[PDB]
Amino acid sequence: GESMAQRMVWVDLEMTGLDIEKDQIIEMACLITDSDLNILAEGPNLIIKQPDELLDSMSDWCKEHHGKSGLTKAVKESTITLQQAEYEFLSFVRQQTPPGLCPLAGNSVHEDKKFLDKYMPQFMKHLHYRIIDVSTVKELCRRWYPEEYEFAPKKAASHRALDDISESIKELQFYRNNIFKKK
Ligand code: NA
């Protein structure tokens, strides 16, 4: 029971931008780890259809980055609606975590939570309200462990959801192994 309740729901999203009032989710991936960051199950890794007009009006940063990664083209070709994507992720976490008990995890994953609370509220209902923000640990590492901070793994920062989740886990594992108290 406690082991199940101590799992983590790792999620990373791509969005058309950071404006919660207009922007939409275009990519989502999800991994489950145990409390010790071992990957237990790989969830859906989905590209969500959104309208051409929204993609055409994205910021220059988003056009450049989602364009070169292939994501923009894949969004235009997608047949996955937001609602169907949500169901895939909700079904996955229902198979993997007890209801209400496990947190979202990722780098600045509160931004993903802001989008998910609005656009996948039933998925979020399965999760705790707390988060495991790897960037909180990053910012504490930078302050309290500046020497160790220089050794954190370099990120490819490809802005593709599943690859970025994996790098987030690796960053948190680095902090656990290097700035937390030794047993
Ligand atoms: Na992210």
Residue numbers in the entry: 4 to 186
Provide the publication's sentences verbatim:
We initially determined the crystal structure of P. aeruginosa Orn (OrnPa) with diribonucleotide substrate; however, crystal packing contacts prevented substrate binding (data not shown). Superimposing the two structures indicates their identical fold (rmsd of 0.75 Å for the protomer), which is preserved in the substrate-free Orn structure determined previously (rmsd of 0.54 Å for the protomer). The pGpG-bound structures reveal a narrow active site that is lined by the conserved acidic residues of the signature DEDD motif (D12, E14, and D112 of OrnVc; D15, E17, and D115 of REXO2) and the general base H158 or H162 in OrnVc or REXO2, respectively. Residue numbering for REXO2 refers to its cytosolic isoform lacking the mitochondria-targeting pre-sequence. The corresponding residues, W64 and Y132, are conserved in REXO2. Most notably, residues S108, R130, S135 and the hydroxyl group on Y129 (S111, R133, S138, and Y132 in REXO2) form hydrogen bonds with the 5' phosphate of pGpG, capping the substrate. This phosphate cap creates a major constriction of the active site, which is not observed in structurally related 3'−5' exoribonucleases such as RNase T or ExoI.
Among them, Oligoribonuclease (Orn) is unique as its activity is required for clearing short RNA fragments, which is important for cellular fitness. Here, we show that Orn exhibits exquisite substrate preference for diribonucleotides. From this we propose a general model of RNA degradation, wherein a combination of exoribonucleases process oligoribonucleotides down to diribonucleotides and Orn completes RNA recycling by cleaving diribonucleotides to nucleoside monophosphates.
